[PDB]
């Protein structure tokens, strides 16, 4: 049950975020590894440089390229994926 809280990317790039995060959740138990999976995939499919944060409790402030930002809920975790550089 994905829930988009704040998206800036295209409906297509947005679908790839959810899907990609889904596979990582089906595979990894540790947030850091889930974050890595998603980051590495986006660096590949959409070129560097991306950054990913996964967790249940945190606040952040970042600088990103417009149309390249997404914050959403998947499972009981929240994912912040964005490109800068």
């Amino acid at each position: 049950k994905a829930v988009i809280k704040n998206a800036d990317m295209s409906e297509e790039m947005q679908q790839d975020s959810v899907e990609c995060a889904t596979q990582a959740l089906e595979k990894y138990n540790i947030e850091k590894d889930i974050a890595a999976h998603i980051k590495k995939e986006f660096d590949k499919k959409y070129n560097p440089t991306w950054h990913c944060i996964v967790g249940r409790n945190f606040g952040s402030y970042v600088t990103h390229e417009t149309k390249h930002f997404i914050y959403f809920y998947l499972g009981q975790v929240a994912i912040l994926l964005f490109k800068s550089g």
Binding site: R56, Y73, L80
Partner: peptide, 12 residues
């Protein structure tokens, strides 16, 4: 090229 500064708070 066209940057934005965004903050997010997570408490689920």
């Amino acid at each position: 090229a066209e940057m934005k500064d965004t903050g997010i708070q997570v408490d689920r």
